[PDB]
Ligand binder design. Sequence first.
Ligand SMILES: Nc1nc2c(ncn2[C@@H]2O[C@H](COP(=O)(O)OP(=O)(O)OP(=O)(O)O)[C@@H](O)[C@H]2O)c(=O)[nH]1
Ligand SMILES: Nc1ncnc2c1ncn2[C@@H]1O[C@H](COP(=O)(O)OP(=O)(O)CP(=O)(O)O)[C@@H](O)[C@H]1O
Ligand SMILES: Nc1nc2c(ncn2[C@@H]2O[C@H](COP(=O)(O)OP(=O)(O)O)[C@@H](O)[C@H]2O)c(=O)[nH]1
Ligand SMILES: COc1ccc(/C=C\c2cc(OC)c(OC)c(OC)c2)cc1O
Ligand SMILES: [Ca+2]
Ligand SMILES: [Ca+2]
Ligand SMILES: [Ca+2]
Ligand SMILES: [Ca+2]
Ligand SMILES: [Mg+2]
Ligand SMILES: [Mg+2]
Lengths: 54, 425, 439, 332
Amino acid sequence: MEVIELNKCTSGQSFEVILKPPSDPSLEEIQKKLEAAEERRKYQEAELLKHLAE
Amino acid sequence: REIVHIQAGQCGNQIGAKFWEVISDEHGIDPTGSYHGDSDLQLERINVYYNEATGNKYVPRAILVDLEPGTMDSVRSGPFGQIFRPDNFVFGQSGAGNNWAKGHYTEGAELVDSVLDVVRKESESCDCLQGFQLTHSLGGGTGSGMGTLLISKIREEYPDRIMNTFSVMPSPKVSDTVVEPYNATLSVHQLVENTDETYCIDNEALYDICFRTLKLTTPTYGDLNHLVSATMSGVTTCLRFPGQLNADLRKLAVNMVPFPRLHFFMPGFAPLTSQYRALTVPELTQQMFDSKNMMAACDPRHGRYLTVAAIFRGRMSMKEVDEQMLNVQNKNSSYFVEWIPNNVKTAVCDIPPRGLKMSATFIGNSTAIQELFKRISEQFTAMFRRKAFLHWYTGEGMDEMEFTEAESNMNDLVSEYQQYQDATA
Amino acid sequence: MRECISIHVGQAGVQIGNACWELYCLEHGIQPDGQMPSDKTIGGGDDSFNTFFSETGAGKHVPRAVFVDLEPTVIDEVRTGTYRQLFHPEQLITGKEDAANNYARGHYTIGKEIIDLVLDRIRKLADQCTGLQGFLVFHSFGGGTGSGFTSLLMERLSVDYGKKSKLEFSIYPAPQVSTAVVEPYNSILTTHTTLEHSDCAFMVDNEAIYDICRRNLDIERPTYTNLNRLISQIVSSITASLRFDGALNVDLTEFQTNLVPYPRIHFPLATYAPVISAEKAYHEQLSVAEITNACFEPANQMVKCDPRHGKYMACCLLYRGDVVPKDVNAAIATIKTKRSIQFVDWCPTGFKVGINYQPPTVVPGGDLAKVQRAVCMLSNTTAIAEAWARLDHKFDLMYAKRAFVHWYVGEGMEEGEFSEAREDMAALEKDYEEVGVDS
Amino acid sequence: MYTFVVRDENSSVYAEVSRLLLATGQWKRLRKDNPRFNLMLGERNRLPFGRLGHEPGLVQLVNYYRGADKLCRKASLVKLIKTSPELSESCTWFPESYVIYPTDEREVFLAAYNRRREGREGNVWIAKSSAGAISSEASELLDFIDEQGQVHVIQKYLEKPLLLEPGHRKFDIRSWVLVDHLYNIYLYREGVLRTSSEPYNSADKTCHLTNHCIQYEEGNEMFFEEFNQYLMDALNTTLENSILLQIKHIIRSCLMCIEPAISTKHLHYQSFQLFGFDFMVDEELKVWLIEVNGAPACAQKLYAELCQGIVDVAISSVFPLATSIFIKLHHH
Ligand SMILES: Nc1nc2c(ncn2[C@@H]2O[C@H](COP(=O)(O)OP(=O)(O)OP(=O)(O)O)[C@@H](O)[C@H]2O)c(=O)[nH]1
Ligand SMILES: Nc1ncnc2c1ncn2[C@@H]1O[C@H](COP(=O)(O)OP(=O)(O)CP(=O)(O)O)[C@@H](O)[C@H]1O
Ligand SMILES: Nc1nc2c(ncn2[C@@H]2O[C@H](COP(=O)(O)OP(=O)(O)O)[C@@H](O)[C@H]2O)c(=O)[nH]1
Ligand SMILES: COc1ccc(/C=C\c2cc(OC)c(OC)c(OC)c2)cc1O
Ligand SMILES: [Ca+2]
Ligand SMILES: [Ca+2]
Ligand SMILES: [Ca+2]
Ligand SMILES: [Ca+2]
Ligand SMILES: [Mg+2]
Ligand SMILES: [Mg+2]
């Protein structure tokens, strides 16, 4: 049980107490996924309008 | 935000008119379109169903459609007839003869463009349109045949908006003509493809409630439409009044419909009214889930609930509401699917309907609804196996194949409901 | 002085942001019109509160905040509220129609239409930062905006602001307060997509906040306002080291350093004490030892779980009020012998402690009693994995039948993304078991 | 009424508890995976405690204490007794035991073994493990441990057991202990002696094992009235005085020791559990704790009354319906 790194100031204090020692995707890669999803939406909508046309 | 309302045919226009009477009363709008309410919650979400014309007038965002003028003339002469926008009356003269083909293929096709013109004109004045609600019956010609044709055209022109219907299912106990099972069967297939939410209002159930519960020896259509208007006011309460849930049609569809085709709801209401005794929350919850209070003639104990949405109106104990809801779920544990966690949702609204201190409205996506579609299918097959009455339809250009396909599709729908009535976790 | 930008996404994130900035203004003496009498340097400064407020020549202290929602009704309450004078209109971004509780609708369909405008306004805040530390992102797991738009925004923030720290405050879904049946789906999806873009995330289980409100505040039916005032007390105790003079947790990097030894296990468990009813007439002030003991009561945790059956990787204690280190060490002595506090064998069994002498501030007319001392404990323990297990089980129940899946595919997602996200969560759960359990 | 679920069909006791609950007409069984239950008669392994106590409106109760495996696992029991100050290596009622891997204690075991060979003392030991369901040479022990692939305990073998006459034969004592959600400790008034029929031969595992599966009185099960009468006639003493005070003492020590780590007070769900304590008795009328079993079966005669005792004390105390067979072991 030891106390280390004690820092004091007007607003408060902080310290550490030890009890026992130890025993990304790019922008283009994003827009490809977003644009892929937009295309799957547009494809499904085109199939709908084709069906309604029939 | 905004909802565009459409009522088509005799049944569609009569229940639609009652709906506008009831909700205009709840929002404090008089028959001249003037606000005379005492609470601000009456006007907070008023624009969901009403446009505001200068002069502080509110006009229902409603479109009235029929192929014969009689019912719409009565609506113009009835109470609140002067509230509707006169340009929004769209009607023909020939009628549809209780014939689905006439509403869908021949007479209706002539009028559809004028209806879509009024629809477009209402949509253009919408800040952000949620979608459409249609009132109609499936047993006639105009609401059924032209109703579904309208839905198809609207989906073509507004594919991303929600399509919601209040659909009155025919019953031999309240039958206008023998061909009602044909019309309904043809309509159901359309609904299965082109609506997101359909409230199944079964005339058999409405009749039973008027006869048995309400003790009315001889019910009229007006008596049924009292139940229908009370229900329609209940299910739209979360759309019209401010609340913690901030509900809209798309959220309701997302949370109520686990599988796109199985979107046919069983509504319920309590207390059944046609009395000054105060109703407690346990009584409201028990009546609400009782078959006798549901407006589709199905036994919920013959299937399982996929999802449930319940709204309680009036000033009452929310803790007691939650207690009773959890309790009723535990008593009826066998009738709720377990593979959908938290599939019963409860909402509260402080404002009660007219003439009640508290009420409860129930929206159930249950597999028991298959009974309804089985009923119709049987009636259909009984006539179709002998081709009875088919000439009325072949005379309008249809072919037997289209009937065989509609029958096959509805039996498929029944099969799909059975699949999930069996499935467990 | 290094700035911190707060981003509030969706209903929960926005309303919690409201509660927080109200509380900050009370804590720093800033009035609703932005004026701060005690600030003698007009128009500028590099004080500690300047990490969260910029200054205008007119003496107004403006939050370094951005509010984002895909529909306007919630942020409109900011625009017309008590603290409306605080924010620039450019800071309150609203859409047309929300995500309808649909992750796919918030991430793909609707998010792709507004992401660049959000990033623009954020860039405008960053430009006035002499040394931006990073972002604090507030959002729900369960909402469509909260989950989907937040995950997209976190990807783009990792792109446009690499080298900057990102911390989350996440509302974990509870049936007692939930809004949608599909919230488990959105939770798994946004966690999978956000996991590698977040340095440290504080989860708040609405069930825990709800029960604390019922039990300690005698509120039978807690509202969002109650929940959010309690949550804002916890958030305030967590960000106080950034907003006040101090030596512990002075920059966002220190949260990672002190609380997160492995990057994926970055969900510290927060515990807060005491929560005392305000309408309560007779009060008694709890000691340092009593509240420090309360930090180990499962009923005061922000996420319900049992730390006794897990292992600690880091434990940090943040006190506010009348507390001196002597009492802290005494209490720790008692507790270490009376509680089951096992650490992983590859980490020290210490406690990093911080004390702010200013006692917790409460909203006037709120439901929280003003106390003389309080503590928030942040500990990274494998026990929190229980919450993931819970969530994952719910996901499994629905996904075995593909229930509701069509609403996501209909927006452009693919069924494969569900399984990918679920496999990531299974990996996360396995990681927690490897770090915390013996055979 | 009350909902409950069953996730352990193999359970002998809770098959009968499951029987009774329906017999009151006020308990309804559910499917295994329906999470809207008041009670869970759950599984032995992988029991998902993390998913308990999160159902709104439900008070949830489970028939197992999370973490009570430290008591009901042999190496865990030995480690728990050596490393707990409340018990300690000094405690008199647990035979000297060591844990050996094929955190290890292979050096200190032999370190004492030499101290016993040199002292000419009785140097017989037994090796066993949790998976299973005796020698004088340590080499023969450790070589037997390395041939199986699991952690094993080596414990002193009690060379001077008390022997029932007529027969000159060994026994073991089984006591059933119910711990409820409030951590009250209830000792079932009826224990059993599980005896050996072949005379003890201190010079063949059957003579030295009491287990029943390996095996005067019906089914080698002697009950407390008879063992008490025998103790009076043969040794001029009672079961209470000579043995039962020590049994109660050991039960209390073990359970109080782990209470702070498994207690469900202040938790979001509540636990109870039925335990089977297995004790040994030497010729000085000293009681030795042999092992603790977390999922024990009962004696066929004692299934009734006892299962009704679980329902009375453990289940209906939390979920009430429309003379005590238990001895409450007091504690603080
Ligand atoms: N604690 C707390 N939780 C909230 C609050 N608002 C919403 N929630 C929770 O957030 C979840 C729903 O997410 P929302 O934030 O409302 O949804 P959203 O991000 O606005 O996205 P949409 O689907 O477009 O409405 C539910 O689990 C609610 O319990 C709030 O103010 N405080
Ligand atoms: N140190 C010792 N001295 C004498 N006999 C011992 C002993 N250790 C074990 N035994 C004998 O071995 C038998 C079983 O040993 P063990 O402790 O593995 O019980 P067990 O788990 O196999 C039966 P249960 O599952 O019903 O508790 C006991 O009945 C006892 O008679
Ligand atoms: N509930 C109710 N059902 C009606 C009403 N009017 C007609 N129906 C039913 O609707 C079906 C007839 O369709 P109808 O609307 O009259 O024909 P349409 O004008 O061609 O649409 C039959 O099932 C009738 O029982 C009504 O006002 N209320
Ligand atoms: C799974 O259950 C749910 C069901 C519906 C919703 C969303 C909106 C909603 C909409 C409603 O009508 C417009 C409504 O009843 C009047 C209602 O009652 C609770 C809720 C959210 C859910 O989690
Ligand atoms: Ca014509
Ligand atoms: Ca035209
Ligand atoms: Ca300044
Ligand atoms: Ca990063
Ligand atoms: Mg008619
Ligand atoms: Mg929202």
